[PDB]
Each structure stands twice: as structure tokens, then as C-alpha cells.
Design a protein around this ligand. Sequence first.
Ligand SMILES: [Zn+2]
Ligand SMILES: [Zn+2]
Lengths: 881, 350
Amino acid sequence: ETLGEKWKARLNQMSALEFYSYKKSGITEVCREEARRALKDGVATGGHAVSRGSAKLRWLVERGYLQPYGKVVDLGCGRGGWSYYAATIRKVQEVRGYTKGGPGHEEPMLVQSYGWNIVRLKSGVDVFHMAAEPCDTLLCDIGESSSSPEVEETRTLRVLSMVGDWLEKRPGAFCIKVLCPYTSTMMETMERLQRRHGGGLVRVPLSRNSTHEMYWVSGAKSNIIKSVSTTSQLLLGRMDGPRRPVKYEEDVNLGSGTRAVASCAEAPNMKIIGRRIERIRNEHAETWFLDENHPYRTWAYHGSYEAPTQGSASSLVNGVVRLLSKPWDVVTGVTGIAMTDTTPYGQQRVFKEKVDTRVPDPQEGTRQVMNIVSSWLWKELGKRKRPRVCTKEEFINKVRSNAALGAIFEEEKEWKTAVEAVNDPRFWALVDREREHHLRGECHSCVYNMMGKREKKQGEFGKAKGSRAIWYMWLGARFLEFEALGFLNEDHWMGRENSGGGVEGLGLQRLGYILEEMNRAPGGKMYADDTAGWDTRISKFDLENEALITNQMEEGHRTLALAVIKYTYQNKVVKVLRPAEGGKTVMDIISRQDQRGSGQVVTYALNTFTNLVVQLIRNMEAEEVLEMQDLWLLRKPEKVTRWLQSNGWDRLKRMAVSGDDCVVKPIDDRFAHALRFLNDMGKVRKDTQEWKPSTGWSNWEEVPFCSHHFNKLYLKDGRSIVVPCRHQDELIGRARVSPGAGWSIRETACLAKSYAQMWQLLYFHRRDLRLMANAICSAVPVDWVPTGRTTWSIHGKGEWMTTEDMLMVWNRVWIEENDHMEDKTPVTKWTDIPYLGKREDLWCGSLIGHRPRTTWAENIKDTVNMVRRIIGDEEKYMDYL
Amino acid sequence: SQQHEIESRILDLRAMMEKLVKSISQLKDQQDVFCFRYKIQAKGKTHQTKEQKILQETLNELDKRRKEVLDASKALLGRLTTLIELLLPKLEEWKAQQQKACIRLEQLETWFTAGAKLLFHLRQLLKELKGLSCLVSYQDDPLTKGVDLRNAQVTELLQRLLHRAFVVETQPCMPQTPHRPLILKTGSKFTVRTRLLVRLQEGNESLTVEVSIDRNPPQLQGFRKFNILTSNQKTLTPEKGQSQGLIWDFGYLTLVEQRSGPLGVTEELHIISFTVKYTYQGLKQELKTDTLPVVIISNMNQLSIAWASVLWFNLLSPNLQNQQFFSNPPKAPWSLLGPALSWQFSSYVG
Ligand SMILES: [Zn+2]
Ligand SMILES: [Zn+2]
């Protein structure tokens, strides 16, 4: 009996080109073909989202029917461009973006338009089962169309149940979408919240033709049947006739930047920073200014100035293994780890996501726990040995082999690489000038500068710090780090034979024996907790606690080491690239008292120190020696000095910790639920909520740590060989990457051969990487030398970098220097070295038996003859069959 | 001017056509490693071991890839439908001069060649986006609305293009006076030459075209008869439309009129149309197209008032393709008829 039903009578019963030809006819559009291809390219600026309805809120909110403010909750966010347009309004203080996601829907995207810090855009959450939360502006945009119109009247009824149950705060205003607003049932549904909460209907002028969507905004104060009746006259006024053509209109734009927010900053001590501010600020005084729009809430902003274009997210692909591997183009994992970033967009976004994080200070009773097991732990290893110094020639010859290769400077002798930069005299002179400063008390040359590299599959697609933010100190203060503290890096001051806890120094080839003789402990399972955001969650009273090694050092050595931990750790400064308007990537300078870096080489001491602390603490809760009634003042120092001086060394006889990682095995199963105190320190876990008890592993042959599950294998002789492993995709996609210094054909050829050797040593047992491996061994010339850097762990020995025949190298590391292998009768054929099992490797991501792998695995000499054309035929090669 | 632009669109459809051919040709294999991983991970019943998370991401980005390839398929749907909608008025306007000046081309043969090759090719390619999910579909994707909505829209698009792309080049004329068409004495030769000017053909069999004469005897006078005492067809093997093109000349055919109004001899109507049983890629569609109004004579003096009749409608008949002419026409302003007879004897001699 209504009018809008004959959309679904005529348009249903008639043909296809009438629907398609009608559907674009006579409707108000906005020109969008640019950013559909422009923001596809990757520019994080443009002041407008890849959405459609931001113009709808432009028309409506500018039209005056809606004036949002304060806190805003979005719903059915999709691409979230509604919220991006909401961000520009000069009353908005927070926006929560909540949407469904999943397959068959539309995931969000992260464009740094204006107002960047103030978004909280969260995917995943389904709002079928969401608790009602307060706001100040409410939005919903979930709309689906049907043939029989009551079917979508049903969905209108559901969503009016969801908002009608939602809006119970009495908030300020709203903007709600209505699917099918031509029922009396909607008028009965509406009139309660009209006599109460008001608003009404406005047809969006820029909607499409063949749908009758109308928005119950909080503005249209009409008698509703006058409005519905009026636009419902415009329904049949805009029903048929001639093909009235398209009207276009200019698109919305605001620009980029980031809106200024409130800050929970702490007043620093300016008398340990300020002269570096006088250095850069008195160096760049004309370019100097104070951005009021600092996106800095837990840190400490102190002005800014302009900056050049630096950094690139254009780290290309190794073409070689690309041209060797057919089916490792089609999978999205090998493309998943292709390109990270150093661009100011990337630095600012990793920064916002998981750096600016205020932590609550834990209680003082926990602090005495820290000082007891800390100072006990120092004096425990202080009983064995004493601090020493180390020297410069150790550091030249140390950086000669591999050490870091991190070539970025700040002072004026900006050169290519460190390995020639060591061959200057003058940096020794200015290093000794900063030794005059720090040895007297001043400081001018301790300034971090990070890069933020995160491991994204496809651009601008939902991931917060998949690889961690990495800070850079300049090399000279890295030497003052080195001489100041780096003896622990050198002479095994937390190795297993000294500290009894951690197996660093050992590579990644013998660790499985260390857990496999952790198998003989009684009681517990493999308890392999992982910690989300390690370096983000280390508080000030951990590194204020760390200075207890000053009780053991030599006197002037205590002045320099205590000095530098005052100068780079107790306080610190970073400068930070930030994109802004017009591409003017204005770089700031920033401060925080409290977190550690990640680039300094003495950080192994602090972290493996720090979690041996926290997990001795967790294991003594796991023996119920401590209780939650022991948080505030004290109960007994004698209970914990007793538990240590009877227990503690014997407990850490049986765990393995490197970096932030841990793997323990207690004698009970109580460890899985010893959790309170730890959350008082605030070291939360991964994939387990805040109080849920943990999960063990009675089996040991797959317990994960340092991204490796370990397998043991048996020979044709019958020889127990523990081998490391990881899922095949995440390594074959590591050889695919090219770093940005491999420009030649020779550099990519030798680096690809470095991956060939590293995989030839450890990862031999799989079927795939062997055929890959000896394949590319035939490709690159025998005459050449593999160089470069495959892994990034400290466990990389650099063993497989030689030009030697690899049978000898396997036979060395995997017969000779094995204590844990007894009968050292040598291998002859690595061809007659057998494999891992079939299905277990298929658990780890193989594709044997598949058609592609079988096909190009039946013709390979041609495939390498491709590259033996592509590189010169004046070389020396080898058979590998 | 016009030809190079429309051939630039034939280049555009070749370009995006082959590019989308590539994108399908990889999405089938991304489907293949997906059904392997699900196939063997599903095998082996001997939590959240990251194989769930990886195969989540494989399904997810396969889903997004299917979305994108359907989106660019829409982007060439709008483009080639604008190609057709602008392609048609050239056909009917060149039809208008083409038998406006019969008083005494292969560009479009090529354009229907490439036109139907691109449409049937995109059809046949679109017929097996099914089998990229008929292994295991198992997702709430755009998978059916795409293949059958867009299958349907391009199905009616090439059925309307097949509906209005079978025309006649050569009108019937005398063998005795090859300069005077539209006039056939009882027993004259049906001097016609048409064409299936869309140059696609199933290579299966040697196809034929049927005539069809005078669908409706009108109100005025359903005229007597004629029986074509010659044949009514020829037969084209597929090797010869590939050789000479799909030419259909039913020339030299002769009639026999049966025996036993103010309009008279040269004022009667007999329009011949032509039944075409056309089928390519299984798409069966029948085609029929009429002719100009032709008069039938019996005597040499009827040539004069027949030809004055021929001008007397061929400049004096809008919406001319119909039955039962001559009834109420307006007379002749000779503003082009003067130039027309000027074409006639000033074509002859001076
Ligand atoms: Zn310094
Ligand atoms: Zn494995």
C-alpha cells in the first residue's frame, strides 16, 4: 500500500540494463577515481579517506543537523572514513572505531589524515554481543538489501534494538542509519525516542539510486510523517522517466598532521639534558619552533625544526631466489614479509601504537623484593668474579668481523660505513672529549634516533609493531657503552657456565640439548611463557635497580659507568621524524625517563638479568614461599634470603633465558597460576588474559622459543641429532628480501649464496631447502664469496660464511665439536644424510607431492641455466646431482 | 577521426582483457595451494598452532584477491558497454546513407569481428569463475552475484548486439537494368547480397540462412502471391567465412506469381526478410532483418512511374521501413530531387 514497494516490484520484475542503467542515473556523486588509485600507491596524505560517506557527514554535519563533540563511538566502521571525517571537528576528543572484520567483510586501513593520535580504531569486535558503553556522539552504518522488503525490515528491527538498547546514557547527539523507513512499525519504534530523544529523518542527497537509505540523525526535528511523506514523495519523483544524467561534485579534503591532545608527561630533570638542547637548538635556531600539535602524551616534547627527506620503504626483492622458486610466489607468506619501513609515517605509527605507553608504578614491597634478589644476584655472581674494563682494539677488531654494521652518524663526518669509519683518528679524539665530559659530569653526545621497522604483509593493513622499534645511538657513545659496560658482552658474564641461566654465546645449534637435558628434571611440564611488549614494559625501578653493579666496580670505572647509565638510561633524549603538512616531515626532539632502548649491546645484560630476576620471583611464588599478603611493607627478609641461600641457584639450574625469552621447568604444576605480583610489576603475556592460568607442554619436542621448535633425528648409523627448525615460509621469504645495499648482480648473488650456505648447514633435513640449496649452489660461481647478514639473533655464529666445501663444515660442527655426540665417526655423503619425516615437515609448511614443485623439480638444470645466462658464462660452477 | 578512437578502445579491451586473463590465471593456483593446505592439514587427526592463523590469512587474502579481480571486471564492464552504446549509431547512420544512395564497410566487419571475439571471450572466461570455487567455495564472498549478475548483463548485451547486427548491403535489382533497383518483374532475378557481418562462426557445420517473405498481409490489399521457383538459400562452410567472410548473396533467384484499390502495379508491397539460425559458444539466437520496400512490375512503361515512385518515397518517407506504402505521401519539393535527376542524366551525358 506504500510507495517505496514498487521499487521492489518494478525493479525486481524487470531486466538487468534497466537496473544498472537506472542505478547510476540522476544521482549526486563525488569524484573519487583519483584516491582509489592515488591512495592505492601509498601516500599517507590527502586529507580524505578511501571511503564514500565522509561526504555524507560533510553535507550533514556542515549542513548543521549534527555537531559532534567529546567522545565518539563508531559502529560498522568498515574503512572507517566516517571516523576520519569525524576527527576533523574542533570539539572531538576521542573516537572509538569498532567493527566486525573477518572474511566476506571489509577490514580497516590506517591513513594518517589530520587528527592521527586521537583515533582508536579496533577491528575484530562483533557488536551482536557488545556491552553498552557511554559516549557523546553515536553512529551506526550497517545496511544490507533484500528482495522481499520485510527481510530487511527485520534487520532494521535488529539494529534499532541495538542502538535503542545502546543509547541509554542519554548522550548528546547521534547519526543513525535506517534501512527501510516506510513502515508504521518504525514510527512506533521511533516516536518513543522522538518524544524522549528527538531527531528525525533526512534523505542523503548523494546516496545511490536503487536503495532507500535514510538516516535517523539527531537533527530533523519535524513531525516525522511530514518528512517521511515528503521524501517519500521524492521517492516516486525520483523513480523513472528519462535517463537524467550524472551530477559530479568536488571531493572533501582537510590535510594531514596530528591533532594536539592532553599529555600525562612527567617533569624531567633539565640539568642532565639541557645542553644537548642548547646544542641542537643553538645549532638550528632559525628553523627552531614549538609545534603545539605534538602527538606526545607520555613522552616529553621540547620544540621542533624542519628536516630533510630521509628513509625509504622501498627495500626491493632478491631477483635470484625469485627466479629459482616457482610456487613461492603464489603464497602470501613470502610476500607477507617483503617490505618493512623507515619512512616518517612508519616511525610515527609504530610510535603511536606501542611506544607512548604510561606505566603505573608498582608498590614498594615489590621494590624491596627487587633489591633483595637483585643485590643478592649481583653478589651471587660477584662472588665468582669481579668487574673489569675492556679496550678499544677489542672494539676495532670486534667490529671487523660482523658486529652491527649500523652506519648512521649525527656529527659532521657523515660517511658511508663504519668499517672504514674506524680508520680515522679524529673520532677517537672527540670520543675522548665526551670522556672528558662524562668523566667530569657534563654530556653532549648521548642522543638516540630510532627507526621503526614493522613486518607488514600488505600496506596500511592492520598491524601494530610486528617487529619492534629499534633505536640508534651514534657509534662514539656506542663505544662509551662498550668500554663502560660491555665486558658482560665479552667474557660471558651471563653465559651458562658463569651465570647458570642463559645459553648465549652458544649459537642456535646446541640449544635443544640444553632443553633435552632439562628433560630429566622432575615435576613440571615445559612452561614457556612469552611476554607481550618487553622493552615497552620495563619501569624506572628496574634500571634504578640495575646500578647495583656500581658496588663492585673500580673507582673511576664506577664514575664512567655510573655516569653513562645516568646519561643514557636514567635519562635520555631522542629526535623523531614526523610527517606533517605539505610533506614537510618536521622532526621533533623528545624525552622520557623510563624505558630501555633496543640497539645497545649491553642490553642483553639488563634483559636476561631482569627476567632471571622476575622468574626466580615467579618460581618462589610457585613454591608458595611468597603470598599476595606480602605486597605492601614486608614480612621477612629472612624467608627470601633463606629461599635463595637454600634454593635459588638450584632452581635456575633448570631454565633457559636469552633476551626477553624464557623457558622454565619447575618441579610442580603450580607455576601455571602464579600471577598476581607479576601483574603488579606488569609483565603481561600473549594470547592469555590477565588472570587466566597458563598452558604447559608435557612434550618437549615442539616447545617454542626464539621462533624455533626443535627436533631430534636419528641416523642410519643410529645417531641422536637434535636439529633446529621453524616454519618453512618465514625463512624462504627471508631470502626473497633485498636490503638496499645489494645493488649489483654480485651482491645479491653472494647474499643469496649466504642463505644457501646457512640453509645447507642447519636446515638440511627438509626436502625443499636442500633442492633449493644445492640448486643455487650450482648457480652462483664457485669462485665467489658469500657475504652479508642473514639472521638477526645473537645466536648467529657466522659459521656458514666460508667458501669451504660444506661437507667439511657439517662434519665439523655436527660431528667434531659436539660433546653431546660421542662416537665421532665422520660423515661421507650428505646425500646419504637422511631427512625429517614426511608429515611432520608437512606440519611445518612443505609442498612436496604438489603439482608445481614436482614439475619444476623435474627440470632444474634449465632453470639455473636461465641465471647462468643472466650472470656471465665466464665463471666456474658445479654439478649438484 | 572516429575510426582511430574506436580502434583505440579495441586496443583498450585487448589490453585489460589480457591483463585480467593473467589475474585469473594466478588466482586459480592460489586456490590450488589453499585447497592443498586445507586438504592435508584436514588430514591427520593423530590449540591454535598457528596453522589456523596462517590458513586464516590464506583464506582472507585469497578472498580479498577475488574481490579485486571482480572489481576490475566491473571496470571493464562499464567501458565495453559504453563502447557498444556508442558503436551502434555508426551502424544505423551508415545504414541510412548506405541505402539512401542506391539510386545509381569492412571497417565494421572487423569491428564486429573483434567485438564478438572480445564479448564471447569474456563470456567463456566468465563461465569458469565457478570452478575456482567448485573445488571448495566455503566462504561468504562475492561469488554468485558476480558470476551470474555479470554473466546475465553481458548475456543480454551481446544478445542485443546480435539482435541488431545483421543487415543488408545490396538491394534487389534487375539483371536487365542493373541501374534500377527496387523493381522486379514477375520472373526477374533477386539480385541481393547480404552478410552475416559479425565474423564469428562455430567451426562445427556448414550453416544456412532462410528467407522469409511478407510476415503480415496488411489492411489495404494482401497481394496475390509469388512462388520463388529458384531456390531460397546457399550454404557456407566455416572454412569460407574464414576465407571470404560470411557473405550471403541470394542473387539470380526468380519467382512465379500465382493466379486465381487505388494503388496499382508499382504501388504494391512485398518485403522479404531473412531467417538466420545463429549460434556461437552454445548461445543460440535467431536473427531476422527486413528490406527496403520493393515494387513489382510487368511492363517497361512501369519503369518510369516506378522510378518516380522510387524518388517519391525515398526522399518522402521518414520511418520508411514498413508495410503497405503509397497511401498518403506528401508531394515532391525538388530541392534535392533536382540534384537527383542531375545525378541521373548529368551522370549520363551533356
Ligand atoms: Zn654523551
Ligand atoms: Zn619441525
